[PDB]
Amino acid sequence: THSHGLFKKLGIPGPTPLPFLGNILSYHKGFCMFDMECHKKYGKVWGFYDGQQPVLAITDPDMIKTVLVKECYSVFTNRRPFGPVGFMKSAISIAEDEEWKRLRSLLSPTFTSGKLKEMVPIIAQYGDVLVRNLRREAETGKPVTLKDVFGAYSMDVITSTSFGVNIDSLNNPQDPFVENTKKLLRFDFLDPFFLSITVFPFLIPILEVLNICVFPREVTNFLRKSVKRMKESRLEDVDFLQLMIDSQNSSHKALSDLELVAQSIIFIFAGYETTSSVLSFIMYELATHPDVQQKLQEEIDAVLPNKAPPTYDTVLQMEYLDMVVNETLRLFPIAMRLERVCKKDVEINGMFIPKGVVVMIPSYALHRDPKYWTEPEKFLPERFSKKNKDNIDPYIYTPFGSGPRNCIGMRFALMNMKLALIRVLQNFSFKPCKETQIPLKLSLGGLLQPEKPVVLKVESR
Amino acid sequence: THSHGLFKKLGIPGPTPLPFLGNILSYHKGFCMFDMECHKKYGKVWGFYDGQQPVLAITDPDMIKTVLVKECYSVFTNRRPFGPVGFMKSAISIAEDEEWKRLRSLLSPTFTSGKLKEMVPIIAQYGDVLVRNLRREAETGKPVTLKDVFGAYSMDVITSTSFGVNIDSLNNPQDPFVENTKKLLRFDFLDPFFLSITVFPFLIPILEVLNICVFPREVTNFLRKSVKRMKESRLEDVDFLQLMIDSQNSSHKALSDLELVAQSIIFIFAGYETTSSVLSFIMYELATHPDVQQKLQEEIDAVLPNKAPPTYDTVLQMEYLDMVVNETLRLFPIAMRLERVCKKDVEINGMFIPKGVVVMIPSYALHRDPKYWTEPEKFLPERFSKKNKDNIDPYIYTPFGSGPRNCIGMRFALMNMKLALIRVLQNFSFKPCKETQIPLKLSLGGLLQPEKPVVLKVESR
Amino acid sequence: THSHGLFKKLGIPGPTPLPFLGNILSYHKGFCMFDMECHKKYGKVWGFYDGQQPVLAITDPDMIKTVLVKECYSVFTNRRPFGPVGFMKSAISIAEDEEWKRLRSLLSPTFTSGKLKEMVPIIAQYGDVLVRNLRREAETGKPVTLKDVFGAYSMDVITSTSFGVNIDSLNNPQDPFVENTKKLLRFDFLDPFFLSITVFPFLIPILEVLNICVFPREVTNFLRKSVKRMKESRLEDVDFLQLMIDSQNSSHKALSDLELVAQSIIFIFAGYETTSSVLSFIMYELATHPDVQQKLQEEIDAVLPNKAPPTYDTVLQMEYLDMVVNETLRLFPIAMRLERVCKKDVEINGMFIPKGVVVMIPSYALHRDPKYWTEPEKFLPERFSKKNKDNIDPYIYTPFGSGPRNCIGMRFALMNMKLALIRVLQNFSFKPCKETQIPLKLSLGGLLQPEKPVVLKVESR
Amino acid sequence: THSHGLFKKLGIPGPTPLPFLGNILSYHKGFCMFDMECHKKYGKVWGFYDGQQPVLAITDPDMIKTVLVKECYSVFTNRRPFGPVGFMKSAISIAEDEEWKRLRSLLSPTFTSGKLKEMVPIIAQYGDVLVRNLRREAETGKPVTLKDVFGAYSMDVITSTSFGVNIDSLNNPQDPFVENTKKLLRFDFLDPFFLSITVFPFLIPILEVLNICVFPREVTNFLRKSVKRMKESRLEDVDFLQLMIDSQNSSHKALSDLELVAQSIIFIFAGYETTSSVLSFIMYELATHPDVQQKLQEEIDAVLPNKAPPTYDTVLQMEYLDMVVNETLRLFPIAMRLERVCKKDVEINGMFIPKGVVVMIPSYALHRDPKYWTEPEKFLPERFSKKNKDNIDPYIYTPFGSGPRNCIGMRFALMNMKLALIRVLQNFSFKPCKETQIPLKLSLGGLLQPEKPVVLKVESR
Ligand code: HEM
Ligand code: HEM
Ligand code: HEM
Ligand code: HEM
Ligand SMILES: CC(C)N[C@@H](CSCCNC(=O)OC(C)(C)C)C(=O)NCc1cccnc1
Structure with a gap:
């Protein structure tokens, strides 16, 4: 009823969809569990329906690269719509086709290593703030x-x-x-809200015309004016805003005032809970594997003796740090899936993909596939040693996606966390508590986040 | 399109409705302005359409009494629906028919003078808090x-x-x-949200099934548990909660736990901005009429010499106080209109009223009708002197409505404000500032509230 | 999600509802099969959900009588809404509460035995027409x-x-x-259309405001004018129209012109496919039980020798005729269920029934319950012999419902069919064909109608 | 509310839109009247809103050619959506972008002069049928x-x-x-239905998911099987079907069985009322201008003496015939407007056109613009004489549109009508009646069609 016949025709396997709901009842244990089970039950590809909406999972690295890299511009340019977004329609992660291509261009130079290296002393200052507060506890x-x-x-x-x-x-x-x-x-x-959207995507336009937005009308309205104050306080009298303001001092067509605000918002949304979540998953791993924590502190004391302040250059120097971080991201890729809408009838790596289908890469499950990862469930940073790092396929390990539409804040995200980890581990050790959930259970819900919030003893070195 | 033919048939006059919008474009200057204009243009009765919804304004005191008092139970029992309310469906001001009648019964004894007289010392304590903060400014x-x-x-x-x-x-x-x-x-x-509801009332059910609620899902969710904590902290170890808890210690059928919460919420909503708004309109009047302010302070010093603490009995003693308050409420009846849905074909005071019509009393306009009020725009407390108070029709002056469905918190509201006014006026005088909007302009919007927020000099007596 | 918790609370058993769909997937084999299975699995009462809508099945004759007769006016007055009906809102079978009570009053005298006895010679004339055409075949x-x-x-x-x-x-x-x-x-x-309505009853208002109607806008528009022609051709210069026209020549409030049209339409809709379907089920039974057919023809030749024309009086004379008809209606009660909306919290025969629940009587299943009927599946007219007819509970056998809201066209329907059967059986015998579906399978769909259309040999006596 | 600000910004003039309705109330006198008035009031370009939807009218031939021809593929490829279409989504006149381009390719060879010349003897046979029936009257x-x-x-x-x-x-x-x-x-x-769609285009998806279709589910369902019978009766044992069947005997990707049906349907819909309407407008002109009718009959008797049967070649021979037809189409271009959706931000002939805007050419009004047409209202076939025909801009006179997306059935339509006109005028004269509406008033509605149906005396030559 009525596109539920699609994959049956194409010869693609998959769970049988109920009328209207498609396969969504199978999300009761979460996106990730659903995805592992399917991959095991059905093989290298399979299909399912989010309501009426056809979703095609793929697990072949070639085919993954064609979607994310080769045919990104031509075919697989956008992500799936998800709800009423109002003016946030212009946020880069939400925009489509040429508007996206434009925004990606105006905003890319903002995330270069050069800009990032300038942002280091700032991100640092709050390392120290983090420490002082930590110490109080x-x-x-x-x-x-x-x-x-x-x-x-x-x-x-x-x-x-x-x-x-x-x-x-x-x-x-x-x-x-x-x-x-x-x-x-x-x-x-x-x-409940988003599941309803899935069964009733025909309700999104209704909600839009009522100016209802999944981004609360108030937080947005506060930041819009906040920015339009800052904008007019700096103008005239180092940050993303400035970089964006300098940019509309001319792709092309500059950056409108409202466009700028939407980026500002999307970065907060992108960086806030993600940076914080990932730092928590890492600290958890570090507490339940005390040797890794020790090795890391020794690496840190070697590069920055006398607890020297970390620098851009000293951060990229630290290899085990990079290993610890990567492995955590394997275990907890907070995006869980990558997705692209198929905008045309195409054939990639021998398979016909009809227009309109959502093509999905199940990152969480791929990150824990036996057929690529020895002891996948186990936390083992050595997988990422300069020795073994070569045996890791970049289209199986994709915490940040891949291609022209990959995470724009990747370098920034990695730099941020690592600066935090260094300053913190220079000062403290992190020990499980009686109340610490071991082993950490993942949320049966829709975000990659612990079932129970991570709590740990903190002692001063 | 399609009920826009109703009043034309019945012989009832009124503005011509546009397709779909009915007469709502005429709200550009506000409910109140629309209502005065109609009353002047069309007479003792008239009709208009909120979208498709037929609204019948009435201004005859007999006819008003029949609706609000005589035929309340039989015919005019409920107010108009207004939007998605979710569990707040059970709040008393929102409920319908027998559920309402039940809730009104369980909750009435809560608002007696006996309960109110017990609540006095509490409301007092914050008079003093009000004073200390005022003094700091x-x-x-x-x-x-x-x-x-x-x-x-x-x-x-x-x-x-x-x-x-x-x-x-x-x-x-x-x-x-x-x-x-x-x-x-x-x-x-x-x-924008509620106007859309009016043109598309067929969208309310859609919003309900998405659990979208005009009462923010979060404030409610916080109070639900807050209460269910308090409930279980008092139980077991003077306020509305307690009075409600004692009541479900048995109309009839008690009070469910969720029912209790909804009342709790509706009281906050009822008392919060109203009490505060009315106190502001009064203080404004008192500052732009310095003699009234002086007379009032002298009345207060006579009843409570040496700035004696006010009491329940001393409050009802003060007549000019009561006059000042009433007149303010004439000028600014913050409900603006009273409304009842017509649940049956009826004939009241010689007029046929068909089922489904909304019957509306335009309180704001009635409070400012020349044909009942000399110099209506003018602020003149003497209208309410024990001398003249008899010449005031109770179905023309209705700041609190009338009948079985009138404001349940009336006595409480009056007592609250007066306690505030007394303690404050015992201590301060209130003087206009250069920045004070004189004469106060009303919001062109949908609430009775000043166009510009009231600001005044405050000096210590 | 969200009322799916109702029956679990009340202690009432029933199939587990899926989110959104409730139990509707269980209609894949049809209303009737679902109902028998439930009755067997769950007992004397049970619950299920048509989408969000709670439905309470009941099978106790006392409790059935309380709903259909005792508390009809007070509580169980209306049927469930089912879709966009536009002006057909005024048809009697669709109307509610006092409007219904009014229409039932204005239209009842139309269906008396006196009026019916006048209609006999007319219904007869087409008996003969039926015969001539039959003979040609x-x-x-x-x-x-x-x-x-x-x-x-x-x-x-x-x-x-x-x-x-x-x-x-x-x-x-x-x-x-x-x-x-x-x-x-x-x-x-x-x-597909009505099932969608069930999952999305919040879509009915949307459809109404688009003037979309389950009664095709065209058939209705043709009859509206057709009547308003006839009305004005008879006026001025024996049928339901006339009876209705004479009635608005004055409950009370007469009958509006549009009201009259809606009744006209609803009668066609009521009588057309029903009379025809039932006559087919009977003729089928008569062909697959040749003795019953013979007995009936002998009864007919006894009352009306020389193939005398049937009359009102001679029709009611014929007892085996009445038996044949009743038994067919037991086997195929074309309404399948009776339903009433519960308009108030009530307690009937010891059970609490909360407001809003749909109360349903499963007539088809009750008509085939072993615990009342020996060999229920078998076609045995003797069950209805004046001997055994007393052992049949009128609230178990309800082809026409019961109470103030029972089939108004009952007497007419019975008279119509019987006149047909008599004139036809006076002339022909009806014999199965090789192509006749034996045993007749019922539609797995939503109407009581044969899976395959009944076809039979017809030979001239 | 909320895109009603668009044209004000761009500097483009136009009528002021009401909230929600945009400018639709201005259609009370019809598309055509609205369009002439705007063109006169606002000049060479203007804007208005069908609900929220921005529409940009243009009248410059260069700019018209850029939209319809130059940038058809790149930018202005599709028409506006208009309602729920279900499977008719695949009809060529409804399809979009590459699917359209494909369908246009598969179906173009069907409309060549070669195929058309084969279809002549068929279309002829019914000329004679037309005559016999005409004669009877x-x-x-x-x-x-x-x-x-x-x-x-x-x-x-x-x-x-x-x-x-x-x-x-x-x-x-x-x-x-x-x-x-x-x-x-x-x-x-x-x-009422389509106007509602315009104010609520967010309701189209809702209607789609209910399988409601502006093409009646029944007519379609009858033709689907009708074709799938014919298809399988011809296969195996000269018409569009055949031409389409031979085509899926292989753009590319052939023609699916359901695709074929949708074309079949769209041709009926395209040719049926259009051919009939245009023939009526012509016959009306011919009756209210008896000399034109005489001249035409003389031209016809010259080319086909003794009432010779018309042929493909003799039809294209007849110049005054072609003149009569063209002029009628100027006066009554039954499409009224041409439209294209703007799929990208572009600048054409010096004007910026933002993505999403509907670009509209007001053919009716252009056909009656004084600044191109002397005595526009007057019926004067000589405008199209081989002498004057050169002074007619092909982007002002566009009864069949222009560009890659122009009327595919143009040659067929012209040939059809002319064959009809010839055989009819060979035999009859057509004379106004007392009851003939002179001068013909156009429907104030949404189709180009006479207010009152054309009726004329017919006498045998
Ligand atoms: C630990 C932190 C983060 C992780 C693991 C992460 C991961 C991802 C992933 C998987 C995607 C989807 C990529 C794809 O579709 O191929 C994405 C997109 C995106 N991310 Fe991040 N991200 C992180 C932090 C950030 C931060 C700090 C920013 C700050 C600017 C950011 C901004 C974005 C944006 C703007 C997009 C959409 C890119 C586009 O559509 O052009 N993310 N991220
Ligand atoms: C200056 C303060 C207030 C004013 C002027 C005011 C006025 C009103 C008015 C005009 C109504 C509608 C009455 C009708 O329809 O006839 C109303 C209803 C109501 N008010 Fe107040 N009110 C005030 C404060 C309060 C307070 C403090 C409470 C606290 C409990 C309260 C609770 C309610 C409730 C529960 C209803 C609905 C009554 C029912 O439906 O049974 N109000 N109020
Ligand atoms: C074999 C033929 C028929 C059968 C078995 C039948 C059965 C029924 C049943 C079971 C109901 C529901 C009663 C209830 O809810 O208790 C009903 C209602 C109704 N029937 Fe019939 N019916 C038949 C023919 C007719 C005919 C010929 C008419 C012509 C007037 C008619 C008019 C109505 C009306 C108007 C109602 C709704 C009554 C109300 O709501 O007041 N039916 N019928
Ligand atoms: C007097 C008769 C007719 C007139 C005046 C007429 C006019 C038009 C016009 C103005 C358009 C829009 C063109 C544009 O957007 O530029 C059109 C489109 C179309 N017409 Fe006709 N038409 C007629 C008869 C027919 C007939 C007989 C057919 C039979 C096949 C037909 C099939 C179509 C189709 C399929 C389209 C859409 C073309 C596309 O999107 O590729 N029309 N017509
Ligand atoms: C649709 C938009 C509104 N949601 C995302 C899209 S980007 C990927 C992260 N979300 C995701 O899991 O979505 C799917 C399932 C990949 C489609 C967004 O705005 N992200 C900012 C952000 C978040 C986290 C890390 N980096 C950046």
């Missing part, structure tokens, strides 16, 4: 909740690198600026 | 914004009379409890 | 399709008893009047 | 209704040229095949 032997302290850090780093605003959000939890921003939390695509 | 000769300081007061009084929670919300603007509650602001029925 | 030994020849008859009888229009619809299949009317076919509540 | 001096007799002809020609089915639809008005087909009438885009 280490001196009072009270088990620490990672996401909050990391949240406050991620928040602190975002505010400063995007707008110049400098706040201790942990101690200023109630700053109007800190407030709005913390409501920019990841979207739970299996919460 | 009087000692620093900085023009004061009424709604905030009154808001904080209204908020303080609500929290304490409904849940026991005691907070200085002005100095604790960032208490989690103070936060959620301040988002319970009056609904702007001419904002 | 008996003389050409060509197997006859019952529903068509009966259809043409039912159609002929409707046209004449409701509007005076006299046509041989079988030989005039292409008369504009015959055309429109044949499109008034029973609604398939398990066809 | 000429011999009984009873004023004739053109559209019916022409309708029957158009219908007869369609059936035969597309499926081989040969019927006298005028005398067989009640052939099942003739029936379904006559319900394929032009869509009234100002009827």
